[PDB]
Write a protein that binds this ligand. Structure first.
Ligand SMILES: Nc1nc2c(ncn2[C@@H]2O[C@H](COP(=O)(O)OP(=O)(O)O)[C@@H](O)[C@H]2O)c(=O)[nH]1
Length: 162
């Protein structure tokens, strides 16, 4: 059974936990930072071991997951300009800890269901293009893009491993 260690990074409140809950537990409440579940992606049974982190008290565990993380979701919220601005910092942090320019990553613009938008889709597409990674628009509330975000990351890890 293939195992993938995934890390979901981004500013506080962008919906990292909400995205992961929706993926793993299939629900959303508008009111756990680690998850572990087996799913089937493209017919391959895959154990996902996931950490959600903004960069929290358990720094040692964070450093471990950053070092061993095989793929990263870089999450911002479409109604949070600062969270979009923070993405570069998170990506640079990952590249440094992993000592590599070729780390599987997906850019995720969450809260796509909300009518308040301050980050344009073109801005995000442009940034992802510069990084050479996929961009996926998501909503943890409506499930838009959720499986696609995580499964695309798993596919980016596979591309990296072979
Ligand atoms: N409308 C909407 N609210 C969301 C979405 N994702 C998260 N939230 C809400 O945003 C707030 C912060 O989410 P949370 O998962 O705790 O963010 P985290 O700090 O990145 O883990 C919560 O009130 C969530 O219900 C989304 O896609 N749409």
């Amino acid at each position: 059974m293939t195992e993938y260690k995934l890390v979901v990074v981004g500013a506080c409140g962008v919906g990292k936990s909400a995205l992961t809950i929706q993926l793993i537990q299939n629900h959303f409440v508008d009111e756990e930072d680690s998850y572990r579940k087996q799913v089937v992606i493209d017919g391959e049974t895959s154990l996902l071991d996931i950490l959600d982190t903004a960069g929290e008290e358990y720094s040692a565990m964070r450093d471990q997951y950053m070092r061993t993380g095989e793929g990263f979701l870089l999450v911002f919220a479409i109604n949070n300009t600062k969270s979009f601005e923070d993405i570069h910092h998170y990506r640079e942090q990952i590249k440094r800890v992993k000592d590599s320019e070729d780390v599987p990553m997906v850019l995720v613009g969450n809260k796509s269901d909300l009518p308040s938008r301050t980050v344009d889709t073109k801005q995000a597409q442009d940034l992802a293009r510069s990084y050479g990674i996929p961009f996926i628009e998501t909503s943890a509330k409506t499930r838009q893009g959720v499986d696609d975000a995580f499964y695309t990351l798993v596919r980016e890890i596979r591309k990296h491993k072979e």
